[PDB]
Amino acid sequence: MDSAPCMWMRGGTSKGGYFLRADLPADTAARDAFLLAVMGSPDPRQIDGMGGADPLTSKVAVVSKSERPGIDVDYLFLQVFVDQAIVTDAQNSGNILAGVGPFAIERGLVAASGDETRVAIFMENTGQVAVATVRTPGGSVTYAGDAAIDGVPGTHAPIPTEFRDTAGSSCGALLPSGNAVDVVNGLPVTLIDNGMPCVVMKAADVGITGYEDRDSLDANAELKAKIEAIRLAVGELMNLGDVTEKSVPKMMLVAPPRDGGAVCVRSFIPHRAHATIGVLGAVSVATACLIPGSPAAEVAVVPEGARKTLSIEHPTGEMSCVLEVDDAGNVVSAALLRTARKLMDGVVFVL
Amino acid sequence: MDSAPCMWMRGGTSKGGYFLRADLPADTAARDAFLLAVMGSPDPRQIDGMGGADPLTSKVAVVSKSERPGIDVDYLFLQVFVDQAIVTDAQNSGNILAGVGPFAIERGLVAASGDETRVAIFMENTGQVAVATVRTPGGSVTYAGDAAIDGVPGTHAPIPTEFRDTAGSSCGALLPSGNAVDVVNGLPVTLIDNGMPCVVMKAADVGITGYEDRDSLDANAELKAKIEAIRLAVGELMNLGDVTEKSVPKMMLVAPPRDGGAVCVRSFIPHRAHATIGVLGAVSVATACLIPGSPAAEVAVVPEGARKTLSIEHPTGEMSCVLEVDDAGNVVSAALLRTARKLMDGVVFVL
Ligand SMILES: [Cl-]
Ligand SMILES: [Cl-]
Ligand SMILES: [Cl-]
Ligand SMILES: [Cl-]
Ligand SMILES: [Cl-]
Ligand SMILES: [Cl-]
């Protein structure tokens, strides 16, 4: 009651606590109080709980067996604020998602089935579907292997992840304005939602090249003020209402690729620069690369073929996105690599 | 083998992983590799393990039943470096120590004995003894209660802690120079070890008042260069050898008390300012307050009586130290309040 079984995992480049739904209070307010206490929030240092004093390590997954047709488990993502008594069920960023498949198997929501085991995951926050393929050699999840992702030392078991029903996850449409491009504060942008609502505009159009490192971007007050005025201006158009204290849309500043990739991106999510790029924001940006004349179309190098592999270059490397594009040109699925690791398993306590 | 039972606790204003000795490899090199992997080191973000990406949350306690006369458990403290593949068994700072008593009781090294339970702890790093009194109402440790310590939100069960055999823990003598005061780079200082080797000098003597906040102190390059030249100059005198890449001695800049206390301290440990003060450094400073004409004697207000309560004021509050002083004037024991909390219990995993 003042404890719950819990597995602490790294999912992608994030970390947090993974629960079975039936182990947390049914009452939302009771649930949030418990998770705040588990993390040690509110406290800039989160010294009296399991948060790592950074929003990326103050995250929670709630997983349960699904009754939806074709779905194996339902997954609710929760952000536990570091220094506010606030838990939000914001848009999925796609990193904590990576631990969901392995966690479900370990907890018996899904039994191991051969040496690899498919987990079909409904993302309750947005209504999207992720199919994760996880290594279960011998009938037990493994986290060891040869996969790498930027921002994570060494190598782990690959978890290839295929996203469906991304389109208009949050905005109700791929293009909530109905336009490929909209002029906003005199600038051409794309308002797009293929898994994450994004505003996609050229880095050069807001006075940077798009190749600056994260620290310089975080210190560029005039850049931040400029794109933030754009974000606040488009919230209604994107069916997002007043975005002032919202986490969306992500601001995606695109420049031509430099390392032979598809596109270069600097992401503000919305107010600080992402060290890499969010998974679902990569899908939105890779999709915008395909819409003609659009800011991202103008900078991107897009390969021919129905199965398009788009290497999205970011501050510290690149994240590769495989778009499967039907003969009508819409994106039918996006596949991206994740990794995760079980770090501690047992019981968490609150006062 | 690639896991161990482990309890994650907050101890004082630090956090880390608590093990039974018999659950870790006997081989030191094997042990260090395992603990590095457990924390997610080396990695500035410690994203692939249980470290909180700060040295204060990248700490380990190793506890076992003691055979020493009068000792209940042996405790070895280990610092797991955040971004280096290095584990050190440095001097005890006294915060992780606070979880040792409760952990021993929970693991059955010591059985609960009534509603409060004494744990006599040998600190293997330095040879000191700490007696911790822990609440065991009903025969089970509790972490709830009305105690507070600066740097930890809310309140917890008190763990009153009494230190003995502090004198010359590391230096072999209370005063390794044999002098109450030594002139170093033209400045009077006290080289003292009553639980933590410290250099004690007046804040004013190095060009600050001693009331500056931590951020200003951390940014004072000329202050840091000045006291660091002092530290490097005294390492041999204190029987510490070449202190260049050492963590000791702590630099303690004392000023007259301002909130009715005994003394005001700003601590460099050795290169960044402490947010409060270390427990054992408080004992060393409180002891130096009693040695006549000495820098700390000149600034301190010392109360009459054989049981002296010295409120050591620090950046974010004060830490109170009860010295029990025998008729010969030496310190016979120092008592200080700690708190701890069990945060997660179960098993930790490495690849
Ligand atoms: Cl459940
Ligand atoms: Cl936060
Ligand atoms: Cl997610
Ligand atoms: Cl043991
Ligand atoms: Cl470190
Ligand atoms: Cl300690």
Short mmCIF file of all heavy atoms in Angstrom, two decimals, chain A residues 6 8 10 13-15 37 43 46-52 57 151 153 155-156 341-351, chain B residues 6 8 10 13-15 37 43 46-52 57 143 151 153 155-156 341-351:
data_model
loop_
_atom_site.label_atom_id
_atom_site.label_comp_id
_atom_site.label_asym_id
_atom_site.label_seq_id
_atom_site.Cartn_x
_atom_site.Cartn_y
_atom_site.Cartn_z
N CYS A 6 8.06 -3.22 -8.60
CA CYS A 6 8.44 -2.25 -9.63
C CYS A 6 9.73 -2.71 -10.29
O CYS A 6 10.62 -3.19 -9.61
CB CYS A 6 8.66 -0.86 -9.05
SG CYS A 6 9.30 0.42 -10.17
N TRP A 8 12.89 -1.14 -12.38
CA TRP A 8 13.61 0.05 -12.82
C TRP A 8 14.37 -0.34 -14.08
O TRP A 8 15.07 -1.37 -14.10
CB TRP A 8 14.56 0.62 -11.75
CG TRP A 8 14.44 2.09 -11.76
CD1 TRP A 8 15.26 2.97 -12.38
CD2 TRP A 8 13.37 2.85 -11.20
NE1 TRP A 8 14.78 4.24 -12.22
CE2 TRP A 8 13.62 4.19 -11.49
CE3 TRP A 8 12.27 2.53 -10.40
CZ2 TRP A 8 12.80 5.23 -11.04
CZ3 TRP A 8 11.45 3.54 -9.98
CH2 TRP A 8 11.71 4.87 -10.29
N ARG A 10 16.20 1.24 -17.93
CA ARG A 10 16.49 2.19 -19.00
C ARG A 10 15.68 1.79 -20.25
O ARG A 10 15.69 0.63 -20.65
CB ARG A 10 17.98 2.20 -19.34
CG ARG A 10 18.21 2.98 -20.66
CD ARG A 10 19.62 2.93 -21.15
NE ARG A 10 20.00 1.61 -21.58
CZ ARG A 10 19.62 1.11 -22.77
NH1 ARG A 10 18.83 1.83 -23.60
NH2 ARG A 10 19.98 -0.11 -23.12
N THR A 13 16.96 6.33 -24.31
CA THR A 13 17.86 7.22 -23.57
C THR A 13 17.18 7.81 -22.33
O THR A 13 17.60 8.86 -21.83
CB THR A 13 18.40 8.34 -24.44
OG1 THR A 13 17.33 8.88 -25.23
CG2 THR A 13 19.51 7.82 -25.39
N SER A 14 16.11 7.17 -21.86
CA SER A 14 15.38 7.57 -20.67
C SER A 14 15.45 6.42 -19.68
O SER A 14 15.94 5.34 -20.02
CB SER A 14 13.94 7.94 -20.99
OG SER A 14 13.94 9.15 -21.73
N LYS A 15 15.03 6.70 -18.43
CA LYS A 15 15.05 5.71 -17.35
C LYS A 15 13.82 5.94 -16.49
O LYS A 15 13.37 7.09 -16.33
CB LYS A 15 16.33 5.89 -16.47
CG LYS A 15 16.76 4.67 -15.64
CD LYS A 15 17.76 5.18 -14.51
CE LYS A 15 19.01 5.78 -15.12
NZ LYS A 15 19.96 6.18 -13.93
N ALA A 37 6.10 10.41 -4.64
CA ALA A 37 6.89 9.95 -3.49
C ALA A 37 7.93 8.92 -3.89
O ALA A 37 9.06 8.95 -3.37
CB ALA A 37 5.97 9.36 -2.43
N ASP A 43 11.75 17.91 -5.75
CA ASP A 43 13.06 18.13 -5.16
C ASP A 43 14.05 18.22 -6.31
O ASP A 43 14.25 17.22 -7.01
CB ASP A 43 13.40 16.96 -4.22
CG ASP A 43 14.80 17.05 -3.59
OD1 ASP A 43 15.51 18.04 -3.84
OD2 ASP A 43 15.20 16.07 -2.88
N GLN A 46 15.93 15.25 -6.08
CA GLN A 46 15.19 13.99 -5.88
C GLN A 46 15.98 13.05 -4.96
O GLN A 46 16.18 11.87 -5.24
CB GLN A 46 14.83 13.29 -7.22
CG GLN A 46 13.79 14.09 -8.01
CD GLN A 46 13.43 13.40 -9.33
OE1 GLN A 46 14.34 12.98 -10.04
NE2 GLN A 46 12.13 13.29 -9.65
N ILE A 47 16.45 13.60 -3.84
CA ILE A 47 17.36 12.82 -3.01
C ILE A 47 16.64 11.73 -2.22
O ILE A 47 17.26 10.73 -1.82
CB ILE A 47 18.15 13.77 -2.09
CG1 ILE A 47 19.35 13.08 -1.46
CG2 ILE A 47 17.27 14.32 -1.00
CD1 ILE A 47 20.38 12.52 -2.48
N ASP A 48 15.35 11.90 -1.96
CA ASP A 48 14.57 10.96 -1.14
C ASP A 48 13.66 10.06 -1.99
O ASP A 48 12.53 9.71 -1.58
CB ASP A 48 13.74 11.71 -0.11
CG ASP A 48 13.24 10.80 1.00
OD1 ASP A 48 13.98 9.87 1.40
OD2 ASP A 48 12.09 11.00 1.44
N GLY A 49 14.13 9.67 -3.16
CA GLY A 49 13.38 8.73 -3.97
C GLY A 49 14.24 8.22 -5.13
O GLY A 49 15.45 8.44 -5.16
N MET A 50 13.58 7.63 -6.12
CA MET A 50 14.31 6.93 -7.19
C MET A 50 14.52 7.76 -8.47
O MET A 50 15.15 7.24 -9.44
CB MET A 50 13.57 5.62 -7.53
CG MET A 50 13.55 4.55 -6.29
SD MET A 50 15.21 4.13 -5.78
CE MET A 50 15.62 3.02 -7.15
N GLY A 51 14.00 8.99 -8.53
CA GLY A 51 14.31 9.84 -9.66
C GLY A 51 15.78 10.22 -9.71
O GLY A 51 16.48 10.32 -8.69
N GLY A 52 16.26 10.47 -10.93
CA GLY A 52 17.66 10.80 -11.12
C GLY A 52 17.92 12.27 -11.24
O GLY A 52 18.98 12.67 -11.71
N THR A 57 15.08 10.92 -16.33
CA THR A 57 15.16 9.77 -15.45
C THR A 57 14.10 9.90 -14.36
O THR A 57 14.30 9.45 -13.25
CB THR A 57 16.57 9.66 -14.84
OG1 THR A 57 16.95 10.87 -14.14
CG2 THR A 57 17.57 9.44 -15.94
N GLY A 151 23.77 8.06 -27.40
CA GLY A 151 23.41 8.46 -26.04
C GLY A 151 23.41 7.34 -25.01
O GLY A 151 23.19 7.61 -23.81
N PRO A 153 25.94 4.19 -23.65
CA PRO A 153 27.20 3.47 -23.77
C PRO A 153 26.95 1.99 -23.99
O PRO A 153 25.92 1.45 -23.60
CB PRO A 153 27.89 3.72 -22.41
CG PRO A 153 27.10 4.82 -21.75
CD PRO A 153 25.72 4.74 -22.30
N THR A 155 26.64 -1.81 -25.88
CA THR A 155 25.65 -2.44 -26.76
C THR A 155 24.68 -3.31 -25.96
O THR A 155 24.97 -3.76 -24.83
CB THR A 155 26.35 -3.26 -27.86
OG1 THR A 155 27.00 -4.41 -27.31
CG2 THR A 155 27.40 -2.41 -28.59
N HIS A 156 23.50 -3.51 -26.54
CA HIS A 156 22.40 -4.20 -25.89
C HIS A 156 21.64 -5.06 -26.92
O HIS A 156 21.95 -5.03 -28.11
CB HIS A 156 21.48 -3.18 -25.21
CG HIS A 156 22.18 -2.38 -24.13
ND1 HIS A 156 22.97 -1.29 -24.42
CD2 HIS A 156 22.19 -2.52 -22.78
CE1 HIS A 156 23.44 -0.78 -23.28
NE2 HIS A 156 22.98 -1.51 -22.27
N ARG A 341 17.24 -1.97 -20.91
CA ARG A 341 17.94 -2.80 -19.93
C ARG A 341 17.21 -2.77 -18.59
O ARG A 341 16.79 -1.71 -18.13
CB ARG A 341 19.39 -2.35 -19.72
CG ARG A 341 20.19 -3.39 -18.87
CD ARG A 341 21.67 -3.12 -18.90
NE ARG A 341 22.13 -2.28 -17.77
CZ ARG A 341 22.22 -2.70 -16.49
NH1 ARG A 341 21.82 -3.93 -16.15
NH2 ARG A 341 22.70 -1.89 -15.56
N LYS A 342 16.99 -3.95 -18.02
CA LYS A 342 16.45 -4.06 -16.68
C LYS A 342 17.60 -3.76 -15.74
O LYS A 342 18.65 -4.43 -15.82
CB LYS A 342 15.90 -5.47 -16.44
CG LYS A 342 15.60 -5.80 -14.93
CD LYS A 342 14.91 -7.21 -14.85
CE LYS A 342 15.88 -8.37 -15.11
NZ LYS A 342 15.32 -9.65 -14.57
N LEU A 343 17.43 -2.76 -14.89
CA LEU A 343 18.47 -2.26 -14.00
C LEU A 343 18.30 -2.76 -12.57
O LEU A 343 19.27 -3.16 -11.93
CB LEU A 343 18.44 -0.73 -14.04
CG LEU A 343 18.39 -0.05 -15.45
CD1 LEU A 343 18.23 1.49 -15.25
CD2 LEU A 343 19.65 -0.38 -16.18
N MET A 344 17.06 -2.73 -12.07
CA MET A 344 16.81 -3.24 -10.73
C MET A 344 15.38 -3.74 -10.76
O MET A 344 14.52 -3.13 -11.41
CB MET A 344 16.96 -2.12 -9.68
CG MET A 344 16.95 -2.67 -8.21
SD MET A 344 17.44 -1.37 -7.07
CE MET A 344 17.33 -2.25 -5.47
N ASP A 345 15.13 -4.85 -10.09
CA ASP A 345 13.78 -5.36 -9.97
C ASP A 345 13.48 -5.63 -8.51
O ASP A 345 14.31 -6.21 -7.80
CB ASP A 345 13.59 -6.66 -10.76
CG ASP A 345 12.13 -6.97 -11.01
OD1 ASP A 345 11.30 -6.08 -10.70
OD2 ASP A 345 11.84 -8.09 -11.50
N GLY A 346 12.29 -5.21 -8.07
CA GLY A 346 11.86 -5.56 -6.72
C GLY A 346 10.68 -4.75 -6.27
O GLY A 346 9.62 -4.77 -6.89
N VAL A 347 10.83 -4.01 -5.19
CA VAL A 347 9.69 -3.31 -4.64
C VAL A 347 10.12 -1.90 -4.36
O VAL A 347 11.22 -1.69 -3.82
CB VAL A 347 9.15 -4.03 -3.38
CG1 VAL A 347 8.11 -3.18 -2.65
CG2 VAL A 347 8.55 -5.40 -3.74
N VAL A 348 9.26 -0.93 -4.66
CA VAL A 348 9.54 0.47 -4.31
C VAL A 348 8.69 0.85 -3.12
O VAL A 348 7.57 0.35 -2.95
CB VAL A 348 9.28 1.49 -5.45
CG1 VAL A 348 10.38 1.41 -6.46
CG2 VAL A 348 7.90 1.28 -6.04
N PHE A 349 9.22 1.76 -2.31
CA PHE A 349 8.56 2.15 -1.07
C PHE A 349 8.32 3.65 -1.03
O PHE A 349 9.17 4.45 -1.44
CB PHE A 349 9.41 1.74 0.17
CG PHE A 349 9.61 0.26 0.28
CD1 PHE A 349 10.66 -0.36 -0.39
CD2 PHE A 349 8.74 -0.51 1.05
CE1 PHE A 349 10.83 -1.73 -0.29
CE2 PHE A 349 8.91 -1.87 1.14
CZ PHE A 349 9.95 -2.48 0.45
N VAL A 350 7.21 4.01 -0.41
CA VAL A 350 6.93 5.39 -0.05
C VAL A 350 6.58 5.43 1.43
O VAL A 350 6.17 4.43 2.02
CB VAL A 350 5.78 6.00 -0.87
CG1 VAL A 350 6.02 5.75 -2.34
CG2 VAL A 350 4.48 5.41 -0.45
N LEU A 351 6.73 6.61 2.01
CA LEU A 351 6.43 6.84 3.41
C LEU A 351 4.96 6.60 3.76
O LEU A 351 4.08 7.30 3.28
CB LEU A 351 6.85 8.26 3.79
CG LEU A 351 8.33 8.37 4.13
CD1 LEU A 351 8.64 9.62 4.97
CD2 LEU A 351 8.80 7.13 4.86
N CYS B 6 20.01 -6.18 -3.47
CA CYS B 6 20.51 -4.84 -3.18
C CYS B 6 19.38 -3.98 -2.65
O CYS B 6 18.27 -4.07 -3.15
CB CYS B 6 21.09 -4.17 -4.43
SG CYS B 6 21.61 -2.42 -4.26
N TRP B 8 18.34 -0.03 -2.33
CA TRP B 8 18.61 1.35 -2.70
C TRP B 8 18.04 2.23 -1.60
O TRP B 8 16.88 2.06 -1.19
CB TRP B 8 18.03 1.73 -4.08
CG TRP B 8 19.03 2.54 -4.79
CD1 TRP B 8 19.06 3.90 -4.89
CD2 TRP B 8 20.20 2.06 -5.44
NE1 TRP B 8 20.18 4.29 -5.58
CE2 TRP B 8 20.89 3.17 -5.94
CE3 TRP B 8 20.69 0.78 -5.73
CZ2 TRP B 8 22.07 3.05 -6.68
CZ3 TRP B 8 21.85 0.67 -6.44
CH2 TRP B 8 22.53 1.79 -6.91
N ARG B 10 18.38 6.27 0.46
CA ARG B 10 18.94 7.56 0.81
C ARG B 10 19.56 7.46 2.22
O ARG B 10 18.92 6.98 3.15
CB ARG B 10 17.88 8.67 0.79
CG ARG B 10 18.44 9.95 1.46
CD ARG B 10 17.43 11.03 1.62
NE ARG B 10 16.42 10.69 2.58
CZ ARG B 10 16.63 10.76 3.90
NH1 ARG B 10 17.84 11.15 4.38
NH2 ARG B 10 15.67 10.44 4.74
N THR B 13 22.18 13.06 3.05
CA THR B 13 21.89 13.77 1.80
C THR B 13 22.54 13.06 0.60
O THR B 13 22.76 13.70 -0.44
CB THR B 13 22.34 15.22 1.85
OG1 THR B 13 23.64 15.28 2.44
CG2 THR B 13 21.36 16.07 2.69
N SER B 14 22.87 11.78 0.74
CA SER B 14 23.43 10.97 -0.32
C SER B 14 22.48 9.81 -0.57
O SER B 14 21.51 9.64 0.16
CB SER B 14 24.82 10.47 0.04
OG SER B 14 25.71 11.57 0.04
N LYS B 15 22.72 9.08 -1.68
CA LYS B 15 21.88 7.95 -2.09
C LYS B 15 22.80 6.89 -2.68
O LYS B 15 23.82 7.22 -3.32
CB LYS B 15 20.85 8.39 -3.16
CG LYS B 15 19.60 7.51 -3.32
CD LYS B 15 18.93 7.85 -4.72
CE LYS B 15 18.47 9.29 -4.77
NZ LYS B 15 17.75 9.51 -6.16
N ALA B 37 29.12 -1.23 -13.37
CA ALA B 37 28.01 -1.61 -14.25
C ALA B 37 26.65 -1.37 -13.60
O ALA B 37 25.70 -0.93 -14.26
CB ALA B 37 28.13 -3.07 -14.66
N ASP B 43 29.64 7.32 -17.38
CA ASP B 43 28.66 7.96 -18.24
C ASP B 43 28.18 9.21 -17.52
O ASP B 43 27.55 9.09 -16.47
CB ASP B 43 27.49 6.98 -18.50
CG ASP B 43 26.36 7.58 -19.35
OD1 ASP B 43 26.47 8.73 -19.78
OD2 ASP B 43 25.31 6.87 -19.52
N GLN B 46 24.87 8.47 -16.57
CA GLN B 46 24.62 7.15 -15.94
C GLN B 46 23.26 6.60 -16.38
O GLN B 46 22.43 6.16 -15.59
CB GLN B 46 24.73 7.19 -14.39
CG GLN B 46 26.17 7.44 -13.94
CD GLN B 46 26.28 7.48 -12.41
OE1 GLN B 46 25.47 8.14 -11.78
NE2 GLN B 46 27.27 6.77 -11.83
N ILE B 47 23.02 6.65 -17.70
CA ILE B 47 21.68 6.32 -18.18
C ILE B 47 21.41 4.82 -18.14
O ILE B 47 20.24 4.40 -18.09
CB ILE B 47 21.49 6.90 -19.58
CG1 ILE B 47 20.01 6.91 -20.00
CG2 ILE B 47 22.28 6.13 -20.60
CD1 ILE B 47 19.09 7.73 -19.06
N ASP B 48 22.45 3.99 -18.19
CA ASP B 48 22.30 2.53 -18.24
C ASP B 48 22.61 1.86 -16.90
O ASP B 48 23.18 0.75 -16.83
CB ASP B 48 23.19 1.95 -19.32
CG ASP B 48 22.80 0.52 -19.69
OD1 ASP B 48 21.58 0.21 -19.70
OD2 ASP B 48 23.71 -0.29 -19.93
N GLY B 49 22.25 2.52 -15.81
CA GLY B 49 22.39 1.91 -14.50
C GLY B 49 21.65 2.72 -13.44
O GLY B 49 20.86 3.61 -13.76
N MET B 50 21.99 2.46 -12.18
CA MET B 50 21.21 3.04 -11.07
C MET B 50 21.80 4.32 -10.46
O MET B 50 21.20 4.89 -9.51
CB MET B 50 21.03 1.97 -9.97
CG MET B 50 20.15 0.68 -10.46
SD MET B 50 18.52 1.19 -10.99
CE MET B 50 17.79 1.47 -9.36
N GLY B 51 22.97 4.77 -10.93
CA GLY B 51 23.48 6.05 -10.49
C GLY B 51 22.61 7.21 -10.93
O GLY B 51 21.93 7.18 -11.97
N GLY B 52 22.63 8.27 -10.13
CA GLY B 52 21.80 9.43 -10.41
C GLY B 52 22.54 10.54 -11.11
O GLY B 52 22.06 11.67 -11.13
N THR B 57 24.87 10.58 -5.60
CA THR B 57 23.93 9.49 -5.77
C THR B 57 24.60 8.35 -6.54
O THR B 57 23.95 7.64 -7.28
CB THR B 57 22.67 9.97 -6.50
OG1 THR B 57 22.98 10.58 -7.79
CG2 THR B 57 21.99 11.02 -5.67
N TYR B 143 11.08 4.32 8.69
CA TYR B 143 11.77 5.48 8.14
C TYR B 143 10.92 6.73 8.28
O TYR B 143 11.36 7.83 7.93
CB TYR B 143 12.15 5.24 6.65
CG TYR B 143 13.01 4.00 6.49
CD1 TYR B 143 12.43 2.77 6.10
CD2 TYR B 143 14.37 4.04 6.78
CE1 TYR B 143 13.23 1.60 6.01
CE2 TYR B 143 15.16 2.91 6.68
CZ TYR B 143 14.59 1.69 6.27
OH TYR B 143 15.39 0.59 6.17
N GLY B 151 18.65 19.86 3.41
CA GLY B 151 18.91 19.18 2.15
C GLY B 151 18.02 17.99 1.85
O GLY B 151 18.11 17.41 0.75
N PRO B 153 13.88 16.96 1.82
CA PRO B 153 12.50 17.36 2.05
C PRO B 153 11.82 16.43 3.04
O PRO B 153 12.20 15.27 3.19
CB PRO B 153 11.85 17.24 0.64
CG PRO B 153 13.01 17.08 -0.32
CD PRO B 153 14.12 16.46 0.45
N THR B 155 10.09 14.93 6.62
CA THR B 155 10.63 14.39 7.87
C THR B 155 10.67 12.86 7.83
O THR B 155 9.95 12.19 7.06
CB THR B 155 9.81 14.89 9.07
OG1 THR B 155 8.49 14.32 9.07
CG2 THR B 155 9.67 16.42 9.04
N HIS B 156 11.57 12.31 8.66
CA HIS B 156 11.86 10.88 8.68
C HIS B 156 12.11 10.43 10.13
O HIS B 156 12.12 11.25 11.05
CB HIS B 156 13.05 10.59 7.77
CG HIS B 156 12.80 10.95 6.32
ND1 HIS B 156 12.93 12.23 5.85
CD2 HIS B 156 12.44 10.18 5.25
CE1 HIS B 156 12.66 12.25 4.54
NE2 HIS B 156 12.35 11.02 4.16
N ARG B 341 16.19 6.51 4.38
CA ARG B 341 14.95 5.94 3.86
C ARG B 341 15.26 4.83 2.86
O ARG B 341 16.14 4.97 2.02
CB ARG B 341 14.08 6.99 3.16
CG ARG B 341 12.66 6.43 2.82
CD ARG B 341 11.70 7.52 2.42
NE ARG B 341 11.64 7.73 0.95
CZ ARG B 341 11.07 6.88 0.09
NH1 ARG B 341 10.55 5.72 0.50
NH2 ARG B 341 11.02 7.19 -1.21
N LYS B 342 14.59 3.69 3.03
CA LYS B 342 14.67 2.60 2.07
C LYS B 342 13.79 3.01 0.90
O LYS B 342 12.60 3.30 1.10
CB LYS B 342 14.18 1.30 2.70
CG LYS B 342 13.91 0.15 1.66
CD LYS B 342 13.55 -1.17 2.45
CE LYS B 342 12.14 -1.13 3.06
NZ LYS B 342 11.68 -2.52 3.37
N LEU B 343 14.37 3.07 -0.29
CA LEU B 343 13.71 3.57 -1.49
C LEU B 343 13.26 2.43 -2.40
O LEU B 343 12.14 2.45 -2.92
CB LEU B 343 14.69 4.48 -2.24
CG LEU B 343 15.42 5.58 -1.38
CD1 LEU B 343 16.45 6.30 -2.31
CD2 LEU B 343 14.40 6.53 -0.86
N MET B 344 14.12 1.42 -2.59
CA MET B 344 13.74 0.28 -3.40
C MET B 344 14.52 -0.89 -2.84
O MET B 344 15.68 -0.72 -2.44
CB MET B 344 14.10 0.51 -4.89
CG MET B 344 13.48 -0.58 -5.83
SD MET B 344 13.68 -0.08 -7.54
CE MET B 344 12.91 -1.49 -8.41
N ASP B 345 13.90 -2.04 -2.78
CA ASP B 345 14.59 -3.24 -2.36
C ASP B 345 14.37 -4.34 -3.39
O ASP B 345 13.24 -4.54 -3.84
CB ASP B 345 14.09 -3.74 -1.00
CG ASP B 345 15.06 -4.69 -0.35
OD1 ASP B 345 16.19 -4.83 -0.90
OD2 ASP B 345 14.69 -5.30 0.69
N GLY B 346 15.44 -5.04 -3.73
CA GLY B 346 15.29 -6.20 -4.60
C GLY B 346 16.61 -6.67 -5.16
O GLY B 346 17.52 -7.03 -4.42
N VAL B 347 16.73 -6.69 -6.47
CA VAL B 347 17.93 -7.25 -7.06
C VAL B 347 18.41 -6.28 -8.11
O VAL B 347 17.60 -5.76 -8.88
CB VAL B 347 17.65 -8.66 -7.65
CG1 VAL B 347 18.82 -9.16 -8.48
CG2 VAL B 347 17.33 -9.67 -6.53
N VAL B 348 19.73 -6.08 -8.18
CA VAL B 348 20.31 -5.25 -9.24
C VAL B 348 20.95 -6.15 -10.26
O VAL B 348 21.46 -7.22 -9.93
CB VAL B 348 21.36 -4.21 -8.76
CG1 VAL B 348 20.67 -3.06 -8.09
CG2 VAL B 348 22.39 -4.88 -7.89
N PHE B 349 20.95 -5.69 -11.51
CA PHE B 349 21.45 -6.49 -12.62
C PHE B 349 22.55 -5.76 -13.38
O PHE B 349 22.48 -4.55 -13.60
CB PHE B 349 20.31 -6.85 -13.61
CG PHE B 349 19.22 -7.67 -12.99
CD1 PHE B 349 18.17 -7.06 -12.32
CD2 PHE B 349 19.26 -9.06 -13.07
CE1 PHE B 349 17.18 -7.83 -11.74
CE2 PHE B 349 18.27 -9.82 -12.49
CZ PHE B 349 17.24 -9.19 -11.80
N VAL B 350 23.50 -6.54 -13.86
CA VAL B 350 24.49 -6.07 -14.81
C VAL B 350 24.49 -7.02 -16.00
O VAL B 350 24.07 -8.17 -15.90
CB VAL B 350 25.90 -6.00 -14.21
CG1 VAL B 350 25.85 -5.25 -12.89
CG2 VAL B 350 26.45 -7.37 -14.01
N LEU B 351 24.99 -6.51 -17.12
CA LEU B 351 25.08 -7.28 -18.35
C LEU B 351 25.99 -8.51 -18.23
O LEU B 351 27.19 -8.38 -18.01
CB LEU B 351 25.56 -6.36 -19.47
CG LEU B 351 24.43 -5.56 -20.11
CD1 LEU B 351 24.80 -5.05 -21.51
CD2 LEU B 351 23.17 -6.38 -20.18
#
